[PDB]
Symmetry: D2
Subunit: 254 residues, 4 copies
């Protein structure tokens, strides 16, 4: 039960965003949500999607995580508008499409660093700023992929960005632990999203999960949302620094 | 919310047992609970502990997991008394005291094979039998310790039994997944229990958790129980073959 | 490397295809003195015939069923009396019933589970204990494992849980014998066609997935395991202990 | 592990204490020919002095700052014209500012973070892309990492997230270049007193904890890293790729 609880959800672009599944779960559990978006269309999209929720009002903040000042001001404004929060769901990543296919060894410096910046560093600065809104502690959750642990065909630069994310999560857990802020990751199995269209060979992976994973089926955004609710609530007190795979057990086999 | 769920909790010895933390939490969530014990003394303690729960009925079964016939007949009797179940919490391990200190290399065969039998094989046979009471799926959780993943001074023969138990979880998740039965583990931090007195250097390790773990505190049995509820419930659908550390982030640091 | 004046015990040659014979060719080529342990009388016969291919000027063959403490204890003691102190042990031993290496892991019997643990994992612990007496200055111990110890591989079943145990065994032994300057490590070998591999279900399917999907796009051989064994057994790998090295074409690194 | 007739590029010697000079002494002694790359002119001065203790009959020195694509590109191109085809590269390059190596990780600046990624992880990708041109028959690339890349070590902070990135880099390069027979691996060295170590908070207390708590009860040195490098760079490690071998007295295997 998340009544009298408030969470900031970053990275909804449409009905299929992993963060929207996260949203519906927390909303149904009675949380107040605040949403952050980058693109104009994500705001319109958000405004439509909010009609399905019970958020009696639309708390939306444009924040591009490439900008220090947008992150800083955005969280500062959230604090002014809504008060202290109980944690943050981070669901933001980027890499250039050319980098998401062919040969990882041909990755450009620019593309390699862009992926790191958006897909990893953004968690560091979000945590720093979000912490100011969590004086009695809280919970931060980032979304990763098994590609950060093993080399997966095509995932390429986003793999090294996710490995960076996953260690980012461990170092934040250690740094923020004394402040009672837990930091974890959900390693989601493959799910059809706007971002997923950009990754080479996505559909082959979908079928292989079905064939080979212990549960013999793919996961949906709501399954990630249910594990988000656990990690964002007191049910997961004692757990920090962790990466929980919500992937039908695929991580555990070979 | 576990109303109309039934779970079997194996391995309560007294009020400090991890499994009793599991019990309190599931009971508070409205689960029907069934308990299994080895020693006479444990059944006595269980009868007295049930007065603190809202369980309106004592469902208690003697099962020494060294005996197949007790596991087979235990569970068959359980299904006759309560019907189908939704999952099993396994909280059972054992080794001889002199295998919990000194030099690992001096472990006897009977000592090594005893720890494997009770602390690992027991899970396989339990899963096989419990499966018969889960025609529509359910969830099985075993209790492990970080010294299954790394060599910890003193933990010795039990380290190798936990490494075996954690694989057992993965091979069972793979086997039982098509049947919609999830198998997972909780890697609990040190907690003063009856069994922990058997382990050399335990107080030292407790203190080092407070000094070194991200949360700078030890965990307790209710925190384990809280994550057991996540895993034994549908909130964790899509999660299987996983090991979730409830250990204040100690697993993530070095 | 160079290995003249070293002596290694190699446990678990059954025939020309054994991984341990790959080890033996490499060490023997590097100048080492070799001592060989076997269970079946047929393995001794093969060994005697395989010795003609090696530079060893002497057969030192010892029967040792690692199910028996007394055979391990007596065997190592006899080795010590015959060849003096040793520099390391290559352990290439494992067993599980076929009744067990296919179909459902949930149906494994207690006796088959403990069998596999006893031979495939406990053996290392007692061997390590007995071999330490022959290594007063320090030494190196290597066991042979497989990726099914770290992940659940279809069909590898009971033997996966025994490799998990074995890999933990190597870490605990590494911690325990470290101060005696004895290193203990594991080689995680890729699928290789051996007598034991014939009783693993779906083995050929896995061989071919390795070629299609592993970074090197090819399977490995016994000599490749031997060459890493020479590394782990020699001073080249001083500083390295409790380690598991995958000799598997990079397959462990991908999903 | 005789290396006559091989050639290796070694990137990141700055002085006698550098881990890469450990590698260089080991390789040089096995009869390889070495090419060295440096950033600061002081590092070239130090290599000129150090080459006098090696057997190399000539100095092959190239300035390469791995922040510049053109320097990496032109530097490898030139190496290829001067010595022709190579057998592998040892990468021993990392950098982070000193604020970012103590106090609170969460306070790391974007610029500090991306600097460390750039020099300590990306440089490997572009070095592999350019060195691959010199290795038409295959070869071996080895980078240097630290345990801090796998677990959060207090004070290692931004460099640990860079090492996580690096270790994944190795895996993705392994898979990409395997079909070209180029092996890519990582040595995870234990703490060693170098120039770069002077910049990490709490380094001395980590050294002491290794002696007290690691299986071998001692620290490792640069030559021990060189010995494992000789293994990884040579044919002894055929079949091994995407691997990370810990040369750290076993400290990675304990908690
Ligand atoms: N779908 C999967 O199979 C899968 C699996 C595992 C992990 N993940 C992870 O899940 C997370 C969300 O991705 P998704 O699949 O749900 O795709 P998505 O709906 O397309 O979400 C990507 C989101 O990232 C946001 N984003 C990108 N750059 C940003 C920036 N610079 N500042 C602020 N927001 C930015 C996008 O915002 P704008 O559109 O407004 O630019 C969008 O809302 C990512 O971390 C992804 O790596 C996805
Ligand atoms: N306390 C910790 O720091 C810690 C940390 C991580 C993991 N764990 C794991 O947590 C689990 C529960 O242990 P605990 O700490 O809660 O200690 P505990 O209270 O002493 O419970 C251990 C249970 O094991 C049962 N058991 C032993 N052998 C059995 C057998 N042959 N058949 C049936 N039951 C048997 C005991 O029952 P009887 O008394 O009736 O014999 C007892 O109820 C164990 O798996 C332990 O390894 C503990
Ligand atoms: N082949 C592969 O794809 C593969 C991959 C990874 C790891 N491995 C591992 O490599 C090692 C060697 O096996 P392999 O593939 O080379 O097959 P192998 O040639 O059949 O050798 C297995 C050896 O195990 C010995 N052995 C079994 N039980 C024993 C006992 N109780 N006492 C003494 N020795 C006993 C056998 O001796 P007897 O013939 O005298 O009974 C035989 O020499 C094993 O540990 C195996 O698990 C194999
Ligand atoms: N010392 C340890 O305990 C330890 C442990 C594990 C891993 N490592 C790793 O070992 C590797 C070697 O470091 P070390 O300890 O031997 O320190 P070191 O002697 O200071 O070597 C570091 C090298 O990095 C080079 N470098 C930095 N930025 C560069 C750039 N932009 N372009 C080209 N080269 C650059 C330096 O060259 P210039 O001086 O010419 O700028 C220097 O030669 C590093 O990857 C480090 O992370 C060290
Ligand atoms: C081999 C492909 C395997 C399936 C990849 C699963 C996945 C889908 C979408 C992702 O979000 C991205 C991906 C790329 C860029 C930005 C966000 C993501 O992280 C992982
Ligand atoms: C090195 C000290 C580390 C602290 C060990 C934490 C722990 C405590 C109790 C355990 O239960 C046992 C232990 C032995 C036998 C039966 C049950 C257990 O698994 C792990
Ligand atoms: C799906 C499995 C994929 C391929 C398994 C590779 C392998 C072959 C032989 C083995 O030695 C055994 C095996 C079983 C029993 C005794 C010794 C071994 O350890 C691993
Ligand atoms: C608290 C951790 C203490 C143990 C640190 C071991 C170590 C020493 C030096 C390193 O080289 C760097 C480090 C920082 C910047 C550039 C090169 C390095 O990677 C790892
Ligand atoms: N076990 C503690 C206290 C006794 C107890 O109450 O269990 C001891 O060893 O002294
Ligand atoms: N008994 C001590 C350790 C010494 C020993 O086990 O011999 C303890 O319980 O911490
Ligand atoms: N034994 C068969 C697989 C079928 C089975 O073992 O059930 C094989 O080796 O391919
Ligand atoms: N050593 C390289 C190739 C042979 C050589 O160039 O030395 C490898 O094993 O891929
Ligand atoms: N670098 C000093 C202390 C650093 C600090 O106080 O930040 C050390 O040796 O630990």
């Amino acid at each position: 039960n998340l009544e009298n609880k408030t969470y900031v959800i970053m990275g909804i672009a449409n009905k299929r965003s992993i963060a929207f599944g996260v949203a519906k779960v927390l909303d149904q559990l009675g949380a107040k949500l605040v949403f952050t978006y980058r693109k104009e269309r994500s705001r319109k999209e958000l405004e439509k999607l909010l009609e399905q929720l019970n958020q009696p009002e639309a708390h939306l903040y444009q924040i591009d995580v490439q900008s220090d000042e947008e992150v800083i001001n955005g969280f500062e404004q959230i604090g002014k508008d809504v008060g202290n929060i109980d944690g943050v769901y981070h669901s933001i990543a980027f890499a250039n499409m050319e980098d998401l296919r062919g040969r990882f060894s041909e990755t450009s410096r620019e593309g390699f660093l862009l992926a790191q910046d958006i897909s990893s560093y953004s968690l560091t600065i979000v945590a720093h700023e979000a912490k100011k809104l969590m004086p009695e502690g809280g919970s931060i959750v980032a979304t990763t992929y098994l590609g950060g642990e093993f080399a997966v065909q095509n995932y390429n630069v986003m793999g090294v960005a996710k490995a960076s994310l996953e260690a980012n999560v461990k170092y934040l857990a250690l740094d923020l632990g004394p402040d009672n802020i837990r930091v974890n990751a959900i390693s989601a199995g493959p799910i059809r999203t706007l971002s997923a269209k950009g990754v080479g060979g996505f559909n082959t992976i979908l079928k292989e999960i079905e064939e080979r994973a212990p549960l013999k089926r793919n996961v949906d955004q709501v399954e990630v949302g249910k594990t988000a609710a656990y990690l964002l609530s007191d049910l997961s007190s004692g757990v920090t620094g962790e990466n929980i795979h919500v992937d039908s057990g695929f991580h555990a086999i070979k």
